[PDB]
Design a protein around this ligand. Structure first.
Ligand code: HEM
Ligand SMILES: CC(=O)N1CCN(c2ccc(OC[C@H]3CO[C@](Cn4ccnc4)(c4ccc(Cl)cc4Cl)O3)cc2)CC1
Length: 403
């Protein structure tokens, strides 16, 4: 039987049509990717089931007798840089996952996030002043990208004379191309080196930022974060702040710009914004794929997945499963979006949801509430989508401010 190759253009060009074709045939099928066999889950019920079954591990560090685990997200990473990337909540299983998440949740709170609202609003205003009131600009470079970066750097106590470079490395890591495995491995070593220096500097000069708080957080029973745990968690938070919300804002802008009717609703009624953000996430989920490792043989949707198999849960495909979302390919800011898998599901449910929703709502409201005639600078079909199954997005988006 023909086995799909996630590297082919079928998974990067009008790819939701490809997912729909595989789903109708089999919501759980074997695929090829980066020279390795794996299983792709595209059905909603199957994806939800997979993410809820703890026999499917999230820890790339675990060793199993006679098997060589090589996960996509760590293509080209030397073993030591891999460990620095994989010693945090997202890359661990209970009970380790449990204590790491409890310690971090003590400081990465809704209160702390809400306290940043005025600042996020100020930063948004300043960036929009800087773009002008007429002409064509790349809204990604001048807005969608700088906003989340400034926010996450103030949250983690990262200086300006350190940014710019980091963003160059982040971008390389989002693409998984075997021809550039070496450059990817090099960019990853750069980020590890940067984080190590940042942490050490913070231990020496404490502040009221999140990294400082994480450094002294401790619990009677759970103790405190080890040096390695601290380092990996900081790395992962900065990485998420540098790339996740950029996709949301850029993709969000492109969608509202290509659905005039939908944009009107938002403009007409502001209370319709929070749900618009949820539908945007539902329609084109940035984390198109999340990975799991079958520590035991598991059955998903009637299909038996052999032990030691790599499972790619396609969060994005599941969001377009007609069985859960009627008329899936229809972008509708009013539909009921409950249950989408863009923020995950279960114990690893994304801890940054509050921050992402804040940035998304504030940015889009300000952007469109300030450029009534804002329109796309190019033809809708000419937009270039980033070729990443790790984090989908738009790197360049020209828009005409004055119409
Ligand atoms: C558009 C924005 C975002 C989306 C769509 C998103 C999506 C996701 C998804 C799907 C997962 C679960 C992955 C899995 O099950 O393996 C996840 C986990 C996580 N995300 Fe996000 N995320 C976003 C923003 C953020 C932000 C702003 C931060 C932090 C500054 C962040 C921090 C995390 C962490 C720490 C985890 C691991 C949670 C755990 O394993 O317990 N995310 N995110
Ligand atoms: C077994 C295996 O291969 N692994 C690969 C993916 N895994 C993972 C890793 C980290 C994670 O914290 C979210 C931190 C970690 O994940 C990213 C993706 N992300 C963004 C927001 N929420 C998730 C991320 C991760 C890796 C790479 Cl290379 C790039 C990026 Cl932007 O940011 C949560 C889960 C778990 C499964």
């Amino acid at each position: 039987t023909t086995v799909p190759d996630l590297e082919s253009d079928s998974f990067h060009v009008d790819w939701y049509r490809t997912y729909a074709e595989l789903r109708e045939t089999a919501p759980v099928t074997p695929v090829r990717f980066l020279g390795q066999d794996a299983w792709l889950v595209t059905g909603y019920d199957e994806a939800k089931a997979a993410l809820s079954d703890l026999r499917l591990s999230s820890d790339p560090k675990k060793k199993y007798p006679g098997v060589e685990v090589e996960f996509p997200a760590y293509l080209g990473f030397p073993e030591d840089v891999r460990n620095y990337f994989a010693t945090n909540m997202g890359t661990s299983d209970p009970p380790t996952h449990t204590r790491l998440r409890k310690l971090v949740s003590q400081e990465f709170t809704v209160r702390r996030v809400e306290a940043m609202r005025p600042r996020v609003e100020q930063i948004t205003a300043e960036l929009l002043d800087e773009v002008g009131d007429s002409g064509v600009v790349d809204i990604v470079d001048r807005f969608a990208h700088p906003l989340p970066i400034k926010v996450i750097c103030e949250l983690l106590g990262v200086d300006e004379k350190y940014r710019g470079e980091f963003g160059r490395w982040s971008s390389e890591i989002l693409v998984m191309d075997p021809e550039r495995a070496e450059q990817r491995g090099q960019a990853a070593r750069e980020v590890v080196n940067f984080i190590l220096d940042l942490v050490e500097r913070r231990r020496t000069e404490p502040g009221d930022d999140l990294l400082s708080a994480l450094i002294r957080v401790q619990d009677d029973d759970d103790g405190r974060l080890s040096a390695d745990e601290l380092t990996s968690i900081a790395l992962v938070l900065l990485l998420a702040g540098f790339e996740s919300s950029v996709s949301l804002i850029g993709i969000g802008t492109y969608l509202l710009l290509t659905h005039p009717d939908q944009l009107a609703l938002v403009r007409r009624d502001p209370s319709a914004l929070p749900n618009a953000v949820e539908e945007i996430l539902r329609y084109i989920a940035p984390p198109e794929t999340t990975t799991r490792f079958a520590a035991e043989e598991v059955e998903i949707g009637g299909v038996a997945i052999p032990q030691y198999s790599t499972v790619l849960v396609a969060n994005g495909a599941a969001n377009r499963d007609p069985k859960q979302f009627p008329d899936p390919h229809r972008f509708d800011v009013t539909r009921d979006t409950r249950g989408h898998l863009s923020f995950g599901q279960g114990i690893h449910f994304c801890m940054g949801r509050p921050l992402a929703k804040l940035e998304g709502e504030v940015a889009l409201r300000a952007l469109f509430g300030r450029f009534p005639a804002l329109s796309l600078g190019i033809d809708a079909d000419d937009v270039v989508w980033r070729r990443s199954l790790l984090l989908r997005g738009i790197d360049h988006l020209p828009v005409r401010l004055d119409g």
